[PDB]
Design an enzyme around this catalytic site. Structure first.
Site, PDB file in Angstrom:
ATOM      1  CB  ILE A 179       3.956  13.910 -16.220  1.00  0.00           C
ATOM      2  CG1 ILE A 179       4.617  13.873 -14.398  1.00  0.00           C
ATOM      3  CG2 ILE A 179       3.157  12.558 -16.378  1.00  0.00           C
ATOM      4  CD1 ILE A 179       3.823  13.250 -13.349  1.00  0.00           C
ATOM      5  CG  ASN A 197      -5.465  11.704 -28.164  1.00  0.00           C
ATOM      6  OD1 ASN A 197      -5.510  11.723 -28.994  1.00  0.00           O
ATOM      7  ND2 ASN A 197      -4.202  11.285 -26.521  1.00  0.00           N
ATOM      8  CD  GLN A 236     -10.896  11.686 -23.486  1.00  0.00           C
ATOM      9  OE1 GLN A 236     -11.328  11.362 -24.323  1.00  0.00           O
ATOM     10  NE2 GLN A 236     -10.772  12.658 -22.519  1.00  0.00           N
ATOM     11  CG  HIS A 274      -6.518  16.059 -22.115  1.00  0.00           C
ATOM     12  ND1 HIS A 274      -7.174  14.944 -22.199  1.00  0.00           N
ATOM     13  CD2 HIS A 274      -5.571  15.212 -23.276  1.00  0.00           C
ATOM     14  CE1 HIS A 274      -7.077  13.839 -22.456  1.00  0.00           C
ATOM     15  NE2 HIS A 274      -6.039  13.672 -22.699  1.00  0.00           N
ATOM     16  CG  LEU A 275      -4.920  21.339 -28.649  1.00  0.00           C
ATOM     17  CD1 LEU A 275      -6.168  22.183 -28.394  1.00  0.00           C
ATOM     18  CD2 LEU A 275      -3.959  21.642 -27.872  1.00  0.00           C
TER      19      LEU A 275
END
Ligand code: B4P
Lengths: 111, 115
Positions: free
Chosen positions: B33, B88, B95, B101-102
């Site tokens: 986003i 992260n 993070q 998450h990648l």
């Protein structure tokens, strides 16, 4: 062959953190954070874009090893894992490598 | 709830909309986003894992699958000049969403150091 192949073969020195039958972790010679190391497969995969489906668990092994090395090196406050691909990615050596950086605040954007 | 109840768990269950690139039984890829590059997307597991530092040994295949899907999606999105994958971890890693998450970033020259 690349310089990382020479490191795996023990022909030139590096500061080795961890080794098993399928990967090697060692401190980066050009550290960009107080802790900055790489985890590389012993198999010569030139870049992540050519990794094969059969390499899936080996690639995940690099990340689990990077996780364990970061904990052993005291990176309790966090870290950043990075894989660079190609020219736009800034890939410096054509042997896939997972970089792990920590010991300071990492910033955004990540390059 | 399958996927947990962070924003990313809500996206997995279609409770919050997202611009999805790829989906299978193990993971989901969708556009970020707040892009930091002309193409910037995320690959997340459907199994909730808060952060990489608590991933289990048996998560090895799943984590490698995130990277395989990231490189496949990058190719489908035409990132033939390259890209950067970023995971992260915690405060120093940057993070805030505690679901692994990648991130994949491309479409411009990435710089060094990576933050
Ligand atoms: N729906 C979506 N769809 C697609 N992509 C998405 C998405 N949502 C997120 N993404 C993307 O997922 C990726 C990974 O996300 P992250 O990097 O983990 O988090 P973020 O969404 O970018 O959180 P942000 O930095 O904006 O919020 P902050 O902690 O400052 O602050 C957040 C709140 O926490 C509070 N807070 C933060 N740190 C605090 C602290 N130390 N103490 C007290 N409060 C704190 C803050 O005041 C604030 O209210 C990002 O690239 C992101 O753009």
């Amino acid at each position: 062959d690349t310089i990382f192949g020479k490191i795996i073969r023990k022909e030139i020195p590096a500061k080795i953190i961890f080794e098993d039958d399928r990967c090697l972790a060692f401190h980066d010679i050009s550290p960009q954070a107080p802790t900055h190391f790489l985890v590389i497969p012993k198999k010569h995969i030139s870049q992540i874009s050519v990794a094969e489906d059969d390499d899936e668990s080996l690639l995940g092994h690099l990340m689990i090893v990077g996780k364990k090395c970061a904990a052993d090196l005291g990176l309790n406050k966090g870290y950043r894992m990075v894989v660079n691909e190609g020219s736009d990615g800034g890939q410096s050596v054509y042997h896939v490598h997972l970089a792990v950086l920590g010991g300071r605040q990492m910033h955004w954007p990540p390059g």
